[PDB]
Amino acid sequence: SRRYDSRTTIFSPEGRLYQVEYAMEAIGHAGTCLGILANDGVLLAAERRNIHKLLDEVFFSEKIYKLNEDMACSVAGITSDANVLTNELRLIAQRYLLQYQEPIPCEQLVTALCDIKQAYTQFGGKRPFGVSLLYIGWDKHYGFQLYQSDPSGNYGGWKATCIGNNSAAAVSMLKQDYKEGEMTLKSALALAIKVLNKTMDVSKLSAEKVEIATLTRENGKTVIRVLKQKEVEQLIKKHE
Amino acid sequence: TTIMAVEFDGGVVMGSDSRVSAGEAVVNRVFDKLSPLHERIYCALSGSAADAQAVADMAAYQLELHGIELEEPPLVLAAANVVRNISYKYREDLSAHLMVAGWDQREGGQVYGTLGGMLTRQPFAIGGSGSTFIYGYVDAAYKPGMSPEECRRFTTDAIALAMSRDGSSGGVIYLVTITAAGVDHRVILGNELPKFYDE
Amino acid sequence: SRGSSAGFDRHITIFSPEGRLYQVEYAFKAINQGGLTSVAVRGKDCAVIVTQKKVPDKLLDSSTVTHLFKITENIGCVMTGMTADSRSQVQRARYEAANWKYKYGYEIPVDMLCKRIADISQVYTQNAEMRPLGCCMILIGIDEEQGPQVYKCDPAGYYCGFKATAAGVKQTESTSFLEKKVKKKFEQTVETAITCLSTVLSIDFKPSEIEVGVVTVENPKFRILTEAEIDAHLVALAER
Amino acid sequence: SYDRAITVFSPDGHLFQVEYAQEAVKKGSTAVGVRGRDIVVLGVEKKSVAKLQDERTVRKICALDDNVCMAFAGLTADARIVINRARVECQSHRLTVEDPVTVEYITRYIASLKQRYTQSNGRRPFGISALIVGFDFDGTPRLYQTDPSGTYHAWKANAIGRGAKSVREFLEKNYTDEAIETDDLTIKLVIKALLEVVQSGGKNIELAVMRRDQSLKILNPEEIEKYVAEIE
Amino acid sequence: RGYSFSLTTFSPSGKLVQIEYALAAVAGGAPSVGIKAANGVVLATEKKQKSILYDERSVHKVEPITKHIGLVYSGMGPDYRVLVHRARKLAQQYYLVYQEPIPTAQLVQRVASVMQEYTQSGGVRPFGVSLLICGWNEGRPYLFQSDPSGAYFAWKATAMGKNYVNGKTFLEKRYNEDLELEDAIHTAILTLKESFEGQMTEDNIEVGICNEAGFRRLTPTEVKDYLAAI
Amino acid sequence: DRGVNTFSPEGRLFQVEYAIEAIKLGSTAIGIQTSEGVCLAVEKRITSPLMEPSSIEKIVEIDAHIGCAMSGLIADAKTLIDKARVETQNHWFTYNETMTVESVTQAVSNLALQFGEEDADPGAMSRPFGVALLFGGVDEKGPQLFHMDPSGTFVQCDARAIGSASEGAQSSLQEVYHKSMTLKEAIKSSLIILKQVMEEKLNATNIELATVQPGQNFHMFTKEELEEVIKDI
Amino acid sequence: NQYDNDVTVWSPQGRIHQIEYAMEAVKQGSATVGLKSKTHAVLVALKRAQSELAAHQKKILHVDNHIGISIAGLTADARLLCNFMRQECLDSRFVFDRPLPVSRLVSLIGSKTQIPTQRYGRRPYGVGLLIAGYDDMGPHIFQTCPSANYFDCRAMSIGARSQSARTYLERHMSEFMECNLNELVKHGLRALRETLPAEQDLTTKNVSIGIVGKDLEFTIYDDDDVSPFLEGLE
Amino acid sequence: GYDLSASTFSPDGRVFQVEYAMKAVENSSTAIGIRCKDGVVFGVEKLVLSKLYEEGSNKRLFNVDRHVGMAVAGLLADARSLADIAREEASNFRSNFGYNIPLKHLADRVAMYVHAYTLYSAVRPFGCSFMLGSYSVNDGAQLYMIDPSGVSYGYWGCAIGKARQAAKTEIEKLQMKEMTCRDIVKEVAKIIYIVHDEVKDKAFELELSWVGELTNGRHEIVPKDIREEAEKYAKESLK
């Protein structure tokens, strides 16, 4: 019996959780995903891997899920685990809306989930979720927000970041090309198509190889919108 | 409700009236109060008809598992021990009464009484609300060593008496004779109930 | 591939590099431990199951060394392989029949019985702690609708309908001969079963060395043919 | 449930999982504290400047109550768990005693918790060392260090995280009653300490401040850099 | 009591090796094919039938889940029976709770979840089946493919099991968006017919159709008719 | 790899042997029993001047008459100390009397072989306590010092040295101890042996000292008292 | 090497190595010898002293008015199983209002120690007991072992070097039904002293004697108490 | 190897733990029973391992119920545990069904119980065989022999332990269908004195029992006079 236990909740001889870092390898092989935090809105841009075949595209997007009235999340890596995490986040935020009669801020939601991923990473011996998540959501305390969480349960707020394939080149291009507090929504669109153009080595970028959904404010209500294909071709053509 | 059983040499005879009344208006004027628990073990229901039915069904289930697992017909003593256990374990929740009767290779005909969760073999084990009106008749007309026709006409007479006096009992009188050959289900229509002093 | 093996694939029910389950396949190697061979075939009127019966010790009470097991008043059963596992599936199958009768108010059809039992062997072929019950249970029963029924469930969870079959060491030659006869067409049926089995064994059986079960349309109750009647069919075989 | 014994002795008497967790702390972002006359300062190294980064949500210096705050280092998620449990337990203490928790109470609590997960079924030890600083109701300053092994201590000023050897050497050399006579000498003590280990001292490992009977006070990054030029 | 730790652990490369292997098992399964027409969906799967002894009408691979949903698989049979009973359970819970036929995207979400739960739970292997769920409602066709890893893809037309690569390349050149249902069935049966190896009959290939009238299996007579003209 | 409940080829649990080796790394503590009461002195082994000396408390109170010295995994002994405290106080509540030392060391000694990895209804203890305690106290039977170890065996001892240098020191205990010894002689003697064994130069900071006398409750000697006793060196 | 890690692994020879290694524990324990006469059931224990200053660990444990034990091996296991035995006897004198017969007691202990000897991840009790008990059937001396087996003995000696004591007890077992109390205890002390190294000697310290019989509830005699019984022994 | 737990078939399909446990039964001392016209008899080659043990130590003839006897072998503690399980079985059957349990159903239940431990790595097989005897006016004498695998077979003559083969060759010398208990007892005695390898493992006891007509179906150990006349005759047949 003890021969069979993989012991997924133990440290190494140098203090590195092998399952969490191997998971970071898996998400390391996932499709790149990046969003940017701006003043007038927030956009997410994810390389799709449903590229192109006899797929049907029955859904509105691939890696963008809607979490409450006021938030959106992008996963990367293990698709199924991303499903479980999304369902769990919806359950959390709706329990907060039951128990407080207001939307849940992004920080509280991310912490509630990241306590879960940490919980698997610590005991129970289950494998950790190999699914990194980028969040976007508005709240009346702190404004537009971007939260990156990873399999280890650690998370942080960012102004624009990229997770997945070529994440290093993506964050590099953001460091070279992000104007803090001065990026507009359209400036964010242009930069995002810049980074995704340079990173995605499959080679000529199409409207089919990515999707982008943007969140802004409109009349005391938050709008979570995905970009139609015409706008994507328009913005890539503009990028040319 | 007036169910009755009798023990004779080759087997038994389980008479029973065929009315179930709701208060003062009847709900069912034909209802077989003899549901088989096995091929040759009938239980005469009474009291809470729903409760009696649930007990007959659960008892039939256990008696069938125990029946097949031994690969031999379950003795009536077994059956009245399972219906006795299920009638005793729930006695605060079931107003049931099940004069379980039958046949078996090892003992021949039997009629066990199981009111309130007890177990007592008896020659004739009458029950039901109408049974409180025929103790006189059965005591005056029961002689041990009854041939089968004597048992059948006997219980028909007795339940006839109970039906004439009791309001909780009316309709037809079912009779089954359980022996080594098998069960012989019979019915007594209201035009055939032997007439007694009517005034 | 081609017999490749990695880690604990050869120890528990997990997929080897090829995709096989070595524990289930070994279990099929385990039905050959009993050293027996059983057969069931069905004609339009009845379904007959004939088996070996090896009583070597002479102290064995021959009344209890039997692979026929009355499952209900209408459902036959012939085990094969390891013995005690066969006993256990007989108890579980009997419990299934009594429970179907209690909850659903009628005799469990053979298809739903053998389906259910196959569902209870699959659970062994998926969980990692318990092994698969090494015993291929064959059933025979007369449904009022489809008629004579013979279904074979094995440690792999499979099961199917059969116009004939065989289980045990000589399943190969048995099924070969039954091919050679079904392609050449059932009233006697029993003559077919004993002819096939005695052929693949080449024994010229004696009336005590085997057993026979029959469930006929005219007689739903599963029943066992004694050594006298099996003597009748055998002697009816020798005299042609 | 998973009930394997993860933490078990080895053939020297060592608990290898504990030594490994302390390994994880030794790669944590270096933190330091000091205990002054009426002030208690904590410094958390830099951690991850990353110009796109958000400052507020990547700090290591959370509040445990009105009078109890804590740094840490190592597996930051785990420390988020311990911080959470300690907060709920502080409030349960105010429910059952009406008195705010002494620093000894909450620290000995968390030390108990870390000790339990060092010694239970299917649970790895926490990879966090927490330097909980706070003020007893009498107002005395309090520094308690808690490591994954669960053993805790009072401290004058102790450093945790990577390179805590050299920094602890620093406070061994420079902690004097002249050093903590005033506020600014105290804070220039802390930042003067980490500056041996904080790349480009000035605006990296910003800090935190708590005054007697005053809620936690935090930088003030520009004010970190004033001290930066003041020491560099 | 049973093993509580996951048996599927991230290999040092980070790709879940058990799901690679399980996908190899489905890759060896009997070939299946599904194509979505404009008004419905076809399901046709190859019977890897051994000896003629088999009562072929005894069990079917294309089982209905409600009046409007189907299933075909590729790989391990008994595992498939598990997922079928689970799916019937789920659609029935949905029908009790909301009083509506379960939309197929939903059912594939839940059954995809159940296929995921065993890539992570204690001491269970992942499934070894790749489902094809075809469904009709809102006047629209649906065809999803769930894998052992739990993820589900929405497809126009697909193929799985033995030789699924040549199957998919066969569909890329032969699927057109305006294909009516019967000509769809013709295209699928041709697709299997590319690598059948055994001279298909109305006994050894199954055909399922889901249209506005609901889902059902085509009796071997009708399937024999479609096996005409080929 | 093997379990926690495995017996070696010699007949001892592995985890109790490796644990009793783990106690060998702890700081040496020593206490001595006399007809006047029992004393307890333990080396703190301060690691850095930045530490608070009053932080390391290896001689803690279990009740008004039972002082519990320890040595080894100081973290583990917290569950033992709290166990004993809850025990003696529940004993006082129920039975309205102080609890004997043998009763306490026996109770708290029941949680030493209570470890496993398959029964585990809670997440119960997954390894033996890496603690060697020395419950000292006085009752109606008078002064008594009960050793205890990870293996759960609690034994009455006249005077015992436990920890890193406990062997040599124990040789000093059999060398110096005699039944008619007076308690101040006990304090002086034990401090002499610790001064023999300690690596660092002895002082009144990196040790502690407690005693429990027939009329005196448990008491920890402060700095000045320790210095006054170390004036004899 | 690959069979000696678990209790639930049958060797190729059909033995459970962990159980045998468990009996090695009682074989290392300090020697304790019991025996019985027509009327008395005597125990005799050498209380090991770890250090010269340390006191000899107790080997005898009151179980009830008529039953006493003598452990040898893992002590904490001994107090666990002793707590179980005590709970049994108290429950019997509670419900049935009569002292538990001894043989039923050692049967309960047998089924108790048998459970972990067959379930994975448990370990056999490494405590080997002698139980003395008087009831209506006369005095009793049961031996129990890590294998959960129990014995009914005329006189048995467990502990390190116990084989000598069992040798002597074979030399003189035929006399034990007739011996009075004192002569009996003399036999026990002699056979127990057969185990120790030659130079070292029985004293009032390292010996304990718990006697129980017809007219006597079970009673344990400590260091000064064995004086009367601890005399002569040439 | 491939033999580290029962839940692991070898490449040839043999749960090595059950076979090993059978090798544990085969190292123990042989016990035999013989069903005959009117009941069943049991002998027990109960090797006494030292002169210290009481006459009657380590009995291997139990009483799982008043109409059923039980002779065991092998690792004896496991035999006791089967005693508790079986006793709970017959008790449960008398409380459920109100009469003495048919022995056949009792060896079904117990056989499923032993079999319950050859499927999991979490537990090991019972390393012990045993025989059950019973007599009743309704079914006569019956003898079932569970082994570590859990399989239940009815025997006219049985033998379990180390000298099983020689005891079988001895049992086949009998017309046990045509003998009564009081004559069976002698022959079982002769069997145990013959099969016992004397020069190796000397000093056993003979511990007999029957259940049948003369005991009114009540399983009880043999009278000492009958056991001693039996040993006398069997030893005389050795000569």
mmCIF file of C-alpha atoms in Angstrom, chain C residues 52-175:
data_model
loop_
_atom_site.group_PDB
_atom_site.id
_atom_site.type_symbol
_atom_site.label_atom_id
_atom_site.label_comp_id
_atom_site.label_asym_id
_atom_site.label_seq_id
_atom_site.Cartn_x
_atom_site.Cartn_y
_atom_site.Cartn_z
ATOM 1 C CA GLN C 52 -17.266 -30.398 -15.989
ATOM 2 C CA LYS C 53 -17.303 -31.893 -12.505
ATOM 3 C CA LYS C 54 -13.954 -33.093 -11.159
ATOM 4 C CA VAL C 55 -14.354 -34.992 -7.882
ATOM 5 C CA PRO C 56 -10.832 -36.409 -7.539
ATOM 6 C CA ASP C 57 -10.494 -36.857 -3.790
ATOM 7 C CA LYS C 58 -13.382 -39.365 -3.480
ATOM 8 C CA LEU C 59 -13.974 -37.834 -0.032
ATOM 9 C CA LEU C 60 -15.537 -34.745 -1.561
ATOM 10 C CA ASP C 61 -19.261 -34.790 -0.942
ATOM 11 C CA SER C 62 -20.219 -34.777 -4.617
ATOM 12 C CA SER C 63 -23.503 -33.035 -3.795
ATOM 13 C CA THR C 64 -21.637 -29.815 -2.972
ATOM 14 C CA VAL C 65 -18.945 -29.638 -5.670
ATOM 15 C CA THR C 66 -21.180 -27.879 -8.171
ATOM 16 C CA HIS C 67 -20.850 -24.818 -10.380
ATOM 17 C CA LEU C 68 -24.607 -24.489 -10.899
ATOM 18 C CA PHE C 69 -26.308 -21.998 -8.631
ATOM 19 C CA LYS C 70 -30.019 -21.275 -8.659
ATOM 20 C CA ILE C 71 -30.086 -17.474 -8.724
ATOM 21 C CA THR C 72 -33.876 -17.143 -8.633
ATOM 22 C CA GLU C 73 -36.865 -19.261 -9.471
ATOM 23 C CA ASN C 74 -36.051 -18.538 -13.129
ATOM 24 C CA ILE C 75 -32.337 -17.706 -13.473
ATOM 25 C CA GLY C 76 -29.540 -20.237 -13.873
ATOM 26 C CA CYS C 77 -25.880 -19.603 -13.239
ATOM 27 C CA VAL C 78 -22.602 -21.312 -14.028
ATOM 28 C CA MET C 79 -19.342 -19.991 -12.619
ATOM 29 C CA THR C 80 -15.792 -20.640 -13.785
ATOM 30 C CA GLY C 81 -12.256 -19.942 -12.624
ATOM 31 C CA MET C 82 -11.400 -19.322 -9.004
ATOM 32 C CA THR C 83 -13.953 -20.894 -6.709
ATOM 33 C CA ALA C 84 -14.501 -18.656 -3.694
ATOM 34 C CA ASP C 85 -14.821 -15.587 -5.901
ATOM 35 C CA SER C 86 -17.538 -17.447 -7.784
ATOM 36 C CA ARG C 87 -19.314 -18.191 -4.504
ATOM 37 C CA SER C 88 -19.174 -14.497 -3.663
ATOM 38 C CA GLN C 89 -20.614 -13.306 -6.979
ATOM 39 C CA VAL C 90 -23.370 -15.867 -6.480
ATOM 40 C CA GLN C 91 -24.282 -14.299 -3.149
ATOM 41 C CA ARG C 92 -24.161 -10.816 -4.644
ATOM 42 C CA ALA C 93 -26.249 -11.827 -7.643
ATOM 43 C CA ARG C 94 -28.849 -13.435 -5.393
ATOM 44 C CA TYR C 95 -29.014 -10.239 -3.371
ATOM 45 C CA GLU C 96 -29.522 -8.299 -6.608
ATOM 46 C CA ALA C 97 -32.417 -10.502 -7.642
ATOM 47 C CA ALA C 98 -34.143 -10.219 -4.276
ATOM 48 C CA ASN C 99 -33.660 -6.468 -4.301
ATOM 49 C CA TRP C 100 -34.977 -6.003 -7.841
ATOM 50 C CA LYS C 101 -37.969 -8.101 -6.827
ATOM 51 C CA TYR C 102 -38.534 -6.024 -3.707
ATOM 52 C CA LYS C 103 -38.146 -2.549 -5.196
ATOM 53 C CA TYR C 104 -39.512 -3.157 -8.675
ATOM 54 C CA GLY C 105 -42.199 -5.774 -8.124
ATOM 55 C CA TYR C 106 -41.205 -8.344 -10.720
ATOM 56 C CA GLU C 107 -38.590 -10.897 -11.673
ATOM 57 C CA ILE C 108 -35.325 -9.259 -12.650
ATOM 58 C CA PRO C 109 -34.673 -10.001 -16.326
ATOM 59 C CA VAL C 110 -31.404 -11.768 -17.035
ATOM 60 C CA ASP C 111 -30.184 -8.785 -19.026
ATOM 61 C CA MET C 112 -30.562 -6.438 -16.076
ATOM 62 C CA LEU C 113 -29.092 -8.957 -13.650
ATOM 63 C CA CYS C 114 -25.946 -9.641 -15.642
ATOM 64 C CA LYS C 115 -25.764 -5.947 -16.503
ATOM 65 C CA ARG C 116 -25.859 -5.089 -12.799
ATOM 66 C CA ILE C 117 -23.205 -7.647 -11.876
ATOM 67 C CA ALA C 118 -20.988 -6.409 -14.697
ATOM 68 C CA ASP C 119 -21.423 -2.961 -13.180
ATOM 69 C CA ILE C 120 -20.150 -4.398 -9.910
ATOM 70 C CA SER C 121 -17.063 -5.952 -11.494
ATOM 71 C CA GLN C 122 -16.200 -2.773 -13.387
ATOM 72 C CA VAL C 123 -15.871 -0.992 -10.039
ATOM 73 C CA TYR C 124 -13.143 -3.465 -9.204
ATOM 74 C CA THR C 125 -11.486 -2.876 -12.560
ATOM 75 C CA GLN C 126 -11.370 0.857 -11.819
ATOM 76 C CA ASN C 127 -10.628 1.372 -8.108
ATOM 77 C CA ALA C 128 -7.088 0.516 -7.131
ATOM 78 C CA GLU C 129 -7.398 -1.251 -3.790
ATOM 79 C CA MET C 130 -9.355 -4.433 -4.573
ATOM 80 C CA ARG C 131 -8.685 -6.839 -7.388
ATOM 81 C CA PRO C 132 -11.135 -8.087 -10.006
ATOM 82 C CA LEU C 133 -13.171 -11.112 -9.018
ATOM 83 C CA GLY C 134 -11.498 -13.779 -11.101
ATOM 84 C CA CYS C 135 -14.620 -15.634 -12.179
ATOM 85 C CA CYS C 136 -16.649 -15.426 -15.379
ATOM 86 C CA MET C 137 -20.285 -15.797 -14.363
ATOM 87 C CA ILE C 138 -22.658 -17.114 -17.052
ATOM 88 C CA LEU C 139 -26.420 -16.723 -16.684
ATOM 89 C CA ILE C 140 -29.402 -18.384 -18.351
ATOM 90 C CA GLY C 141 -32.996 -17.303 -17.998
ATOM 91 C CA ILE C 142 -36.248 -17.251 -19.913
ATOM 92 C CA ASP C 143 -37.680 -13.783 -20.364
ATOM 93 C CA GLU C 144 -41.292 -13.809 -21.523
ATOM 94 C CA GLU C 145 -40.409 -11.300 -24.246
ATOM 95 C CA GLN C 146 -37.093 -12.231 -25.861
ATOM 96 C CA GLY C 147 -37.125 -15.900 -24.831
ATOM 97 C CA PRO C 148 -34.046 -17.958 -23.980
ATOM 98 C CA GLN C 149 -31.283 -15.739 -22.632
ATOM 99 C CA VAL C 150 -27.612 -16.503 -22.037
ATOM 100 C CA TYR C 151 -25.307 -13.700 -20.911
ATOM 101 C CA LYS C 152 -21.642 -13.904 -19.998
ATOM 102 C CA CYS C 153 -20.080 -11.411 -17.625
ATOM 103 C CA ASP C 154 -16.362 -11.619 -16.951
ATOM 104 C CA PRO C 155 -13.760 -9.853 -14.757
ATOM 105 C CA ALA C 156 -13.432 -7.186 -17.445
ATOM 106 C CA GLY C 157 -17.041 -6.145 -16.907
ATOM 107 C CA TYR C 158 -18.082 -7.060 -20.447
ATOM 108 C CA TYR C 159 -21.188 -9.039 -21.195
ATOM 109 C CA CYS C 160 -23.217 -9.862 -24.248
ATOM 110 C CA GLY C 161 -25.881 -12.000 -25.796
ATOM 111 C CA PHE C 162 -25.007 -15.470 -26.992
ATOM 112 C CA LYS C 163 -26.342 -18.225 -29.162
ATOM 113 C CA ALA C 164 -23.638 -20.342 -27.523
ATOM 114 C CA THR C 165 -20.478 -19.863 -25.500
ATOM 115 C CA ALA C 166 -18.006 -21.486 -23.146
ATOM 116 C CA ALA C 167 -15.839 -20.448 -20.230
ATOM 117 C CA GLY C 168 -12.750 -21.977 -18.698
ATOM 118 C CA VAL C 169 -9.483 -23.433 -19.954
ATOM 119 C CA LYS C 170 -10.781 -24.628 -23.328
ATOM 120 C CA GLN C 171 -12.825 -21.552 -24.241
ATOM 121 C CA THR C 172 -10.896 -21.375 -27.514
ATOM 122 C CA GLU C 173 -11.634 -24.836 -28.905
ATOM 123 C CA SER C 174 -15.146 -24.712 -27.452
ATOM 124 C CA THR C 175 -15.992 -21.460 -29.217
#
